[PDB]
DNA sequence: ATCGATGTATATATCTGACACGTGCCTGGAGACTAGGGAGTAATCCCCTTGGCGGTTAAAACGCGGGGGACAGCGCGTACGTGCGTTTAAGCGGTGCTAGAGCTGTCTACGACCAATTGAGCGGCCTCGGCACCGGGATTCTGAT
DNA sequence: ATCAGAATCCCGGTGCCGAGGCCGCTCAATTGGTCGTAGACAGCTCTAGCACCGCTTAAACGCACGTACGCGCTGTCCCCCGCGTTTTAACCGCCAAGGGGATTACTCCCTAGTCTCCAGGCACGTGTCAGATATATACATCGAT
């Protein structure tokens, strides 16, 4: 509890800053009189009225015990006006102007009072899909229909359907049973209370995790007064178990950074966090065509691995790169034998120094190619596909100012990586899929490597059925999409035919969270772990690392 | 009155009449003269406070033009405001350039 | 005998509010009078030119506030605008 | 005895910068003002307050000009203000074309 | 009567300005400069009076002639 | 929307003074702004002067003394001569 | 004639000048000789500038008056230079002048 | 996008050409810094006025007339952009 | 080879640049600088290109005048090379700051 | 004082888009009439300016000795100009997106106008104390040894 | 450092006149009511600003070398300064005369306002020639020998 004069003296200047906005302030200076103002339904919408005078009064008469209560009322006033008035209206835009003045005023005042910040924070809104169509989606603030907070429909494709009954999966629900609502909900950030001074701070600002510091949160202010420091965070990236692969990659990266000798470079940590054996099954079209006649294996075994790179930024771990791979060993049947495929990779653009970021991503990929080559994998495979809009390959909710490459830029990026790999004599050469097939004198679809989740298994299903029994347009399909599909020769020619068994020295690593991309995306979504800002990514990394350490 | 109805000390009616007669615009909003009188009053309070301080520093109880000149030139913001104005019987700030002082 | 006006008594009242021990000489009174006149002239002229620029025909408080923000240096302008808004609010509120 | 050249000037500075009384003799300046007004309109009468105002304005202007001249003269590694300094200060101020 | 601005008068004026040692041609140059300034201000004051249909230059006329030239003068009833 | 200007008038004056000379659009704009500036100066000075004399009307006398004040010597003399000649030619008919 | 500008033997518009003298709140009532006088003096000043501008242009062997010629005409004439002492002419340029000391020996 | 350190956009040869127009013959190497400062101190006094006009008329585009007025107010008027 | 003695290319440049009227500060860096300075007063402001051009013209004129007066001071001081104190002295004397 | 290498002006051909003119359209200017007050003008009064005479004394004027600063010359060190090769990014030409300037039509709240009214403020009177002044003392600088 | 020797600040006592308070009134601010429109606001159109991408090439940057200039030093000389003495005319006090500044009353004619009508001026389009640009040449000129 601060002395009421202490609060008044500190906060009143922020309130005056709003008052002295003419004419913007005027609509907010006195309690809304619904009838006088010619608006009867105001209290049907606004259930907790608030205005400057009411706030001034509570402030003058010491009704606030702590400054966030003042901030909450200010924001209640603003949201009341944004709620009742149209986006295009006068009062709405006035309100917006006041809120901007307020945000700028309030932040340094709150910090003067011993707080992390004075900002009002809320999480990004989740994207709502549609059960009506494959990748239909609902837009923020626009109206939609939902059932059991589970089945949602865009206002268009909801009214599309003839009649008054919807079908969810095989049971039938009257339209009247759906909720009509706007996608305008934003969840506030959480606070944690200093156990000594009692100040409430943003959990993400102070990075307090209950598992890491179970004794409780104590702010930096209180710690410094008694010359204390937080107990060490033992749930770090560095303390995750090492592997031969992780070590090899991180040595390559850090040796590169040391050669560059750029100011303010940090050490990179690379960890393999999952390794398990899986199988890809041939889909029904291709299986009817070639498996049932014994021309192709019904399935192919591979090892999947997930790996991540971390850097320390402002004293804290930051996960900035992630990748999953499929590795088809020497025991695997042709056509997949001794091949690696990149399932997906992703990044969060906070790496320092910026001007070595791309270089470092390339070093990770070149190192990985070099490593599997050494094990006796002959060939790498890359599908250059950027994420579609609003999908994330690995990291939930990217920074809005992280641009997503289009296909031509992404293709060139892989080419630049591979060209460096060739000049280092790691990659022998590489070709697009069409040229490679030509060189291999390929004649049938059963000869194409068959990877989990890849383009070619799906397009082959489509092709066989379109042609009513089918390979017919295979060269044409390859030519058409060729720029997107890289085939990378690690071990060339006669040497590729007489190799010893592939023996991976690294053990299996059971981690369900990292068995493919879905589980970590789901976790992140369910726990508001975004990678959309430096501070949120630092929080999300901290939580990810606790999860990886605790199993 | 209106000077009391706003907590002011300068006259609001006089400022309103001056705004009307001086032909500064066709009409004058009712909010303008109050604001203008408040601004004038604040500026006069500032000048008089600084002058009173300077006079007390000079062992005098009555403000004289020299004290006004000193309170204007010493302060920075006011000096910038009243840049090209000369005050009768004002005098000059005491200053001697460093090079001129003896060695 | 003509009845000429001035700002003498008002400056006296302000002085008594800000330094209760202190008197003001007649010449300093004339100087303060001329100073108030000059500042008021500057502000009114600037508000007039604003009103003309925006092709509007009335000098409401907004033009006066903008003229103050234009004529005075930073800190003095901020304080003057604060004072102005406070006075206008107390005027409009009470009656 | 004898004050070494350069200290009576400093004492005069310290004494004159403290006072505010007028430094140009009233009657010579009044006759100068009348002589100058003789050329623009014959038989003009001057309110004494206006002559006082003219004297205050001329004093202020000359004091400012000598201040800026001394700035120039000190900048040129010298100590003695000179007519070129006056003229240069006025040219730089933009007062004279 | 320009010789009415005596040499010690310019000496005192300058000593107020902050000079320490004065040359010998200053006096003449200052006489010239002051004559020019007076010519300008008095011309403007006269013109004002000659407009107002009067034969006595009022202190208000000089104050206005100064305020016009960007040399506003407080203390004479502006 | 019609936008007023002093283009054709300055053009006529130029044709009177230099019968075989044209004026570029940018110089046209410059002159168009200079005329506005001088007119504003003269009118403002006449207004201030008429307020000084406690008069409520701007007649030719004010404009004349305003020209006497603003312009330097020879320009003032010639401009005053032009003004009186024009006002006489006007009142004559 | 009909138009009030023709009666004065002028070229500038007296009606527009009169309207402007009313519309900007320069005084309660505007006289009837003031617009004529003001248009006359405006015309004279414009003619005065355009004379020297055309001369300077003919000096550079050109037919069209460009901002450089106006700058030269304004900065060469002693009197105009004083009336326009604090105005910067866009695209104008400056007067060609080099101090004597800077020249070689 | 946020902006920073654009003051170095006034290159050394730019200030050199400017001075060469003004009639200077030899520029001391310390001028190229000081001048930049001066230029900033000028702009922060024009824009701060122009903006104030714009913020008045309830607009978000600083019009050429606004800059011309901000200049004219400082006794540095500018012919050729409107009036 | 052939090498002009120091001090003549400066004069050639003086003549060449005083003869012409084009702008001297690069347009895009100056535009970015103007936007940077303006962003400090009101975020998300848009600039009419004509206004940026007017700002550039005014800055060019101010700097040219300042360098003119600075060169005049530096010649008054029995020197030839303009220096930062000259710029600052010229602006102090002009009555600006 | 020539030679040569470089930059500058001159003379001519080609092409272009910016300036000069012709036309329709519309609204701002012109013409005729009227009511009203702002200004011109006569008369008066008394303030304030001009003019003058005498004394007194502070300040201007003049002459002299000389110490200190202006100024000229010189030599030293280096910071800046000039030219060249290398590297950066401004400039230009499109290509697209759209926030916001600008215009219009409707409605009402705010300010001008006017009659009645009264107290805030101005003109005039009178008192006393804040400051002008003066003499005496204490302290503080400045200059020669 | 150490002394004398002028300058300056401090303190106390005397007096005087200018500021501050008090009183009378009269005219300008206040209050109340009405009427008209300037401006607020919602809605629409569409231009100009912003972003972006690629290609070209002028322009900025770094560097080496040399030299002309900044600057510190030293000597000479004359010219302001401080001071004492002689001269004068500012200054103050007082008186006397009269011009004109200011005020008031009266009358008129100049302008604001209103309506009604039509031509000057602006937007638009179109046509061509002044000037930009490229190329060859004659001359100026700057620097090394």
Rounded CA separation E36/E73 (Å): 19
The Cα-based distances of G82 to A292, A486, G88, I51 in angstroms read 103, 77, 13, 28
Which tokens sit at D88? 């240069």
β-bridge partners, A153: A145
Question: Are the Cβ atoms of G28 and B25 closer than 8 angstroms?
Answer: no
β-bridge partners, A307: A272, A323
Per-residue three-class SS string for D43-84: CCEECHHHHHHHHHHHHHHHHHHHHHHHHHHHHCCCCEECHH
Contact criterion met (CB below 8 Å) for E48 and D34: no
Contact criterion met (CB below 8 Å) for B101 and D23: no
H or E element at residue B37: helix B32-57
β-bridge partners, A380: A340, A488
Rounded CA separation D69/A102 (Å): 51
Contact criterion met (CB below 8 Å) for A335 and A343: no
**Residue D53 half-sphere exposure, CB side, CA atoms within 13 Å?**
27
Rounded CA separation I49/I47 (Å): 6
Rounded CA separation A339/I26 (Å): 56
Place of tokens 């090492």: A242
Neighbours of D18 (CB within 10 A): 12
Rounded to the nearest 5 percent, the helix, strand and coil shares of chain F are 75, 5, 20
Say which nucleotide is closest to residue B1, CA to C1' distance: K30
Question: Which residue, among C72, C42, E62, C84, has the nearest Cα to B47 in the 3D structure?
Answer: C72
How far, in Å, is the CA of I44 from the C1' of nucleotide J99? 11
**Residue A486 half-sphere exposure, CB side, CA atoms within 13 Å?**
26
Rounded CA separation E54/A19 (Å): 53
Query: Would you call B98 an interface residue with chain E, using a CB distance cutoff of 8 Å?
Result: no
DSSP per position, A499-538: PPPP---SPPB--GGGSSSHHHHHHHHHTT---SSHHHHH
Q: Considering CB atoms only, which of I24, I58, I83 is closest to H18?
A: I24
Domain I1-97 homologous superfamily, CATH: Histone, subunit A (1.10.20.10)
Neighbours of A170 (CB within 10 A): 5
Rounded CA separation A54/A15 (Å): 11
Tell the burial category of I6 from Cβ atoms under 10 Å away from its Cβ (0-12, 13-18, 19+): exposed
The Cα-based distances of G61 to A268, D19, F4, G51 in angstroms read 72, 63, 33, 15
The top-level CATH class assigned to E1-78 is mainly alpha
Place of tokens 């030839």: I80
H or E element at residue A455: helix A455-466
Paired sense of beta strands E73-74 and B86-87, if any: parallel
| Maximum Cα interatomic distance, chain F, rounded to a whole number of Å | 49
Nearest chain I CA: its distance from D13 CA (Å): 21
Tell the burial category of A21 from Cβ atoms under 10 Å away from its Cβ (0-12, 13-18, 19+): middle
Neighbours of A503 (CB within 10 A): 9
Rounded CA separation A442/A439 (Å): 8
Rounded CA separation I58/G86 (Å): 12
Rounded CA separation E27/E19 (Å): 14
Question: Which residue, among A133, A156, A161, has the nearest Cα to A145 in the 3D structure?
Answer: A156
Measured between CA atoms, the residue of chain H closest to residue G97 is H23
Place of tokens 């089918």: A470
Rounded CA separation I67/I87 (Å): 7
Contact criterion met (CB below 8 Å) for A394 and A346: yes
Angle between helices B12-21 and C26-53 (to 10 degrees): 50
Domain boundary assignment for chain E: 1-78
Which experimental technique did the depositors report for determining this structure? cryo-EM
Tell the burial category of A57 from Cβ atoms under 10 Å away from its Cβ (0-12, 13-18, 19+): exposed
| Residue I51 neighbours by CB under 8 Å, 6+ apart | H50, H62, H63, H64, H66, H67
The Cα-based distances of C86 to A498, B34, C46, C80, C93 in angstroms read 91, 10, 22, 10, 11
Rounded CA separation E35/A27 (Å): 62
Tell the burial category of A361 from Cβ atoms under 10 Å away from its Cβ (0-12, 13-18, 19+): buried
Which tokens sit at I77? 């001081």
How far, in Å, is the CA of G79 from the C1' of nucleotide K132? 35
Q: Which of E44, E47, E51 to mutate to test the interface with F (most CBs of F within 10 A)?
A: E51
Q: The CATH number of H4-83 is which of 3.40.50.1110, 3.30.70.20, 1.20.120.1760, 1.10.20.10?
A: 1.10.20.10
Chain mean position to CA D16: 13
| Residue D91 neighbours by CB under 8 Å, 6+ apart | I72
**Phi/psi at A138 (5° precision):** -105, 140
Question: Which residue, among D80, A115, H79, has the nearest Cα to G83 in the 3D structure?
Answer: H79
β-bridge partners, A346: A322
Rounded CA separation A8/A59 (Å): 6
Rounded CA separation E64/A144 (Å): 73
Place of tokens 């005078």: A53
Spell out the domains of chain F, with CATH numbers in brackets. 1-93 (1.10.20.10)
DSSP per position, I27-49: HHHHHHHHHHHHTTTSSS-EE-H
DSSP per position, A72-122: HHHHHHHHHHHHHS-TTSHHHHHHHHHHHHHHHHHHHHHHHTT-S-----B
Rounded CA separation A508/D29 (Å): 108
Contact criterion met (CB below 8 Å) for I78 and D76: yes
Encode A451-489: b = buried (16+ Cβ within 10 Å), e = exposed: bbebebbebbbebbeeeeebbeebeebbbebbbbbbbbb
Contact criterion met (CB below 8 Å) for A23 and C63: no
Angle of CA points A476, A478, A480, to nearest 5°:
70
Rounded CA separation B66/A117 (Å): 49
Contact criterion met (CB below 8 Å) for D14 and B83: no
β-bridge partners, A388: none
Nearest chain E CA: its distance from F41 CA (Å): 12
Contact criterion met (CB below 8 Å) for I85 and I74: no
E-strand spans in chain I?
46-47, 81-82
**Phi/psi at A234 (5° precision):** -85, -5
| Residue A495 neighbours by CB under 8 Å, 6+ apart | none
Rounded CA separation C7/A208 (Å): 64
Neighbours of G61 (CB within 10 A): 6
Contact criterion met (CB below 8 Å) for A300 and A391: no
Q: Which of G62, G93, G95, G103 to mutate to test the interface with I (most CBs of I within 10 A)?
A: G93
Rounded CA separation H61/I47 (Å): 5
Paired sense of beta strands A316-328 and A339-347, if any: antiparallel
Rounded CA separation C10/B11 (Å): 8
Rounded CA separation C40/A396 (Å): 61
Q: What is the three-class DSSP state of G86?
A: coil
Range of the domain at G89: 4-102
Tell the burial category of A200 from Cβ atoms under 10 Å away from its Cβ (0-12, 13-18, 19+): middle
β-bridge partners, A128: A138
How far, in Å, is the CA of F22 from the C1' of nucleotide K128? 15
Rounded CA separation B15/A286 (Å): 93
**Which residues from A are below 8 Å from C65, CB to CB?**
22
Question: Are the Cβ atoms of E12 and D61 closer than 8 angstroms?
Answer: no
Question: Which residue, among B14, E74, C7, B21, has the nearest Cα to F51 in the 3D structure?
Answer: B21
Measured between CA atoms, the residue of chain E closest to residue F60 is E51
Measured between CA atoms, the residue of chain H closest to residue I34 is H43
Angle between helices I27-38 and I49-76 (to 10 degrees): 100
Q: Would the CA dihedral through A447, A449, A451, A456 be positive or negative?
A: negative
H or E element at residue E10: helix E7-17
Contact criterion met (CB below 8 Å) for A321 and A361: yes
Rounded CA separation A196/A192 (Å): 12
Place of tokens 């000429």: C4
Nearest chain H CA: its distance from C82 CA (Å): 17
DSSP per position, H5-55: -GGGGS-HHHHHHHHHHHT-SEE-TTHHHHHHHHHHHHHHHHHHHHHHHHH
Chain mean position to CA A131: 23
Question: Which residue, among A395, A407, E33, has the nearest Cα to D66 in the 3D structure?
Answer: E33
Question: Which residue, among G80, G2, G5, has the nearest Cα to G35 in the 3D structure?
Answer: G5
Rounded to the nearest 5 percent, the helix, strand and coil shares of chain E are 65, 10, 25
DSSP per position, E66-78: HHHTT--EESS--
Domain boundary assignment for chain D: 1-97
Rounded CA separation A68/A1 (Å): 12
Rounded CA separation B23/G24 (Å): 10
Start-to-end C-alpha separation, chain H: 33
Gaps in chain B (C–N > 2.5 Å) come after which residues?
none
**Phi/psi at A449 (5° precision):** -50, 140
Rounded CA separation F29/G94 (Å): 19
Question: Are the Cβ atoms of G102 and I75 closer than 8 angstroms?
Answer: yes
**Phi/psi at A476 (5° precision):** -65, -40
Tell the burial category of B79 from Cβ atoms under 10 Å away from its Cβ (0-12, 13-18, 19+): middle
**Residue I36 half-sphere exposure, CB side, CA atoms within 13 Å?**
15
**Which residues from F are below 8 Å from E51, CB to CB?**
49, 53, 61-62, 65
Query: For the CA atoms of C6, C11, C12, C18, what is the dihedral angle to 10 degrees?
Result: 180
Which tokens sit at H50? 């122009």
E-strand spans in chain C?
23-24, 58-59
**Which residues from D are below 8 Å from B96, CB to CB?**
10, 13-14
CATH number of the CATH domain containing G60: 1.10.20.10
Query: Would you call E70 an interface residue with chain B, using a CB distance cutoff of 8 Å?
Result: yes
Question: Are the Cβ atoms of G54 and F34 closer than 8 angstroms?
Answer: no
| Residue G52 neighbours by CB under 8 Å, 6+ apart | G73, G74, G76, G77, G80
Rounded CA separation B82/C39 (Å): 10
Whether G and H touch, i.e. at least 3 CB pairs below 8 A, reads as yes
Encode D52-69: b = buried (16+ Cβ within 10 Å), e = exposed: bbbbbbbbbbbbbbbbbb
- Strand K nucleotides where any atom sits below 7 Å of a protein CB: 5-8, 18-20, 27-31, 38-43, 48-51, 59-61, 66-71, 79-83, 89-91, 99-103, 110-112, 119-123, 130-131, 142-144
Rounded CA separation A346/A323 (Å): 6
H or E element at residue C51: helix C26-53
Which tokens sit at I40? 């400090």
Place of tokens 């509007």: C56
Question: Which residue, among G53, G50, G52, has the nearest Cα to G42 in the 3D structure?
Answer: G50
Rounded CA separation A254/B75 (Å): 59
Question: Which residue, among H68, A291, F85, has the nearest Cα to G39 in the 3D structure?
Answer: F85
In terms of phi and psi (left: phi > 0; alpha: psi -120 to 50; beta: otherwise), the region of C57 is alpha
* Whole-number CA gyration radius for chain B: 19
Angle between helices H31-56 and H64-73 (to 10 degrees): 110
Measured between CA atoms, the residue of chain B closest to residue D21 is B89
Rounded CA separation A142/A182 (Å): 5
Paired sense of beta strands C58-59 and B27-28, if any: parallel
Angle between helices A4-19 and A52-60 (to 10 degrees): 160
- Strand J nucleotides where any atom sits below 7 Å of a protein CB: 5-8, 18-20, 27-31, 38-40, 48-50, 59-61, 66-71, 79-84, 89-91, 99-103, 110-112, 120-124, 130-131, 142-144
């Amino acid at each position: 509890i601060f002395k009421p004069e202490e609060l008044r003296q500190a906060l009143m200047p922020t309130l005056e800053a709003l008052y002295r906005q003419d004419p913007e302030s005027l609509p907010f200076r006195q309690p809304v009189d619904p009838q006088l103002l010619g608006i009867p339904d105001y209290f049907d919408i606004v259930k907790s009225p608030m205005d400057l005078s009411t706030i001034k009064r509570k402030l003058d008469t010491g009704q606030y015990q702590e400054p966030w209560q003042y901030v909450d009322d200010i924001w209640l006033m603003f949201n009341n006006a944004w709620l009742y008035n149209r986006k295009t209206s006068r009062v709405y835009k006035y309100c917006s102007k006041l809120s901007e003045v307020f945000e700028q005023e309030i932040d340094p005042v709150m910090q003067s009072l011993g707080y992390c910040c004075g900002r009002k924070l809320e999480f990004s809104p989740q994207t709502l899909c549609c059960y009506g169509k494959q990748l239909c989606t609902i837009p923020r603030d626009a109206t939609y229909y939902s059932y059991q907070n589970r089945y949602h429909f865009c206002e268009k494709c909801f009214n599309e359907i003839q009649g008054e009954s919807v079908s969810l999966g095989q049971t039938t629900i009257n339209k009247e049973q759906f909720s009509k609502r706007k996608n305008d909900t934003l969840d506030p950030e959480l606070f944690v209370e200093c156990t000594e001074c009692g100040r409430k701070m943003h959990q993400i600002c102070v990075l307090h995790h209950e598992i890491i510091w179970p004794a409780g949160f104590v702010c930096d202010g209180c710690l410094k007064k008694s010359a204390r420091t937080r107990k060490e965070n033992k749930f770090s990236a560095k303390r995750l178990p090492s592997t031969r692969l992780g070590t090899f990659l991180e040595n390559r990266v850090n040796d590169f950074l040391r050669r560059q000798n750029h100011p303010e470079s940090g050490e990179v940590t690379v960890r393999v966090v999952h390794a398990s054996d899986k199988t890809v099954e041939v889909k029904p079209g291709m299986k009817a065509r070639f498996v049932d006649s014994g021309e192709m294996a019904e399935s192919f075994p591979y090892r999947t691995k997930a790996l991540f790179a971390f850097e320390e930024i402002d004293g804290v771990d930051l996960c900035f790169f992630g990748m999953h791979v499929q590795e088809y060993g020497s025991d695997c049947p042709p056509p997949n034998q001794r091949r690696v495929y990149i399932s997906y990779l992703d990044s969060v653009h906070f790496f320092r120094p910026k001007c070595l970021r791309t270089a470092v991503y390339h070093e990770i990929l070149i190192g990985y190619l070099e490593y599997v080559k050494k094990l006796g994998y002959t060939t790498g495979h890359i599908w250059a596909c950027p994420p579609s809009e609003g999908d994330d390959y690995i990291f939930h909710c990217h920074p809005p100012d992280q641009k997503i490459p289009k296909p031509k830029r992404l293709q060139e990026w892989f080419k630049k990586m591979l060209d460096k790999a060739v000049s280092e004599r790691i990659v022998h050469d590489y070709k697009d899929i069409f040229k490679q097939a030509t060189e291999d004198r390929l004649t049938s679809a059963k000869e194409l490597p068959y990877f989990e989740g890849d383009f070619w298994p799906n397009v082959l299903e489509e092709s066989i059925k379109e042609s009513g029994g089918s390979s017919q347009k295979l060269y044409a399909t390859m030519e058409k999409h060729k720029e997107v599909f890289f085939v990378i020769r690690l071990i060339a020619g006669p040497a590729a035919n007489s190799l010893p068994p592939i023996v991976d020295p690294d053990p299996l690593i059971p981690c369900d969270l990292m068995d493919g991309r879905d589980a970590f995306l789901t976790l992140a979504r369910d726990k508001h772990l975004e990678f959309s800002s430096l501070r949120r990514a630092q929080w999300s990394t901290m939580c990810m690392l606790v999860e990886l350490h605790t199993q | 009155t209106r000077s009391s109805r706003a907590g002011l000390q300068f006259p609001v009616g006089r400022v309103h009449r001056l705004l009307r007669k001086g032909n500064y615009s066709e009409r004058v909003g009712a909010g303008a003269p109050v604001y203008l009188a408040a601004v004038l009053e604040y500026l006069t309070a500032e000048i008089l406070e600084l002058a009173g301080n300077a006079a007390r520093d000079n062992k005098k109880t009555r403000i004289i033009p020299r004290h006004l000149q000193l309170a204007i030139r010493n302060d920075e913001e006011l000096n910038k405001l009243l840049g090209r104005v000369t005050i009768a019987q004002g005098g000059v700030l005491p200053n001697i350039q460093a090079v001129l002082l003896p060695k | 005998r003509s009845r000429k006006e001035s700002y003498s008594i008002y400056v006296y009242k302000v002085l008594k509010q800000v330094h209760p021990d202190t008197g003001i000489s007649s010449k300093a009174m004339g100087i303060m009078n001329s100073f108030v006149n000059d500042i008021f002239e500057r502000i009114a002229g600037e508000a007039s030119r604003l009103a003309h620029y925006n092709k509007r025909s009335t000098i409401t408080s907004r033009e006066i506030q903008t003229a103050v923000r234009l004529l005075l240096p930073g800190e003095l302008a901020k304080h003057a605008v604060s004072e102005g808004t406070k006075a206008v609010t107390k005027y409009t509120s009470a009656k | 005895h004898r004050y070494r050249p350069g200290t009576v000037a400093l004492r005069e500075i310290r004494r004159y910068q403290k006072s505010t009384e007028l430094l140009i003799r009233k009657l010579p300046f009044q006759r100068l003002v009348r002589e100058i007004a003789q050329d623009f309109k014959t038989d003009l009468r001057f309110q004494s307050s206006a002559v006082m105002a003219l004297q205050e304005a001329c004093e202020a202007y000359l004091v400012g000009l000598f201040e800026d001249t001394n700035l120039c003269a000190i900048h040129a590694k010298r100590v003695t203000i000179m007519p070129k300094d006056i003229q240069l200060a006025r040219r730089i101020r933009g007062e004279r074309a | 009567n320009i010789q009415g601005i005596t040499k010690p008068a310019i000496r005192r004026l300058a000593r107020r300005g902050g000079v320490k040692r004065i040359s010998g041609l200053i006096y003449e140059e200052t006489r010239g400069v002051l004559k020019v300034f007076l010519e300008n201000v008095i011309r403007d004051a006269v013109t004002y009076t000659e407009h107002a249909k009067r034969k006595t230059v009022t202190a208000m006329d000089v104050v206005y002639a100064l305020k016009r030239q960007g040399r506003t003068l407080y203390g004479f009833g502006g």
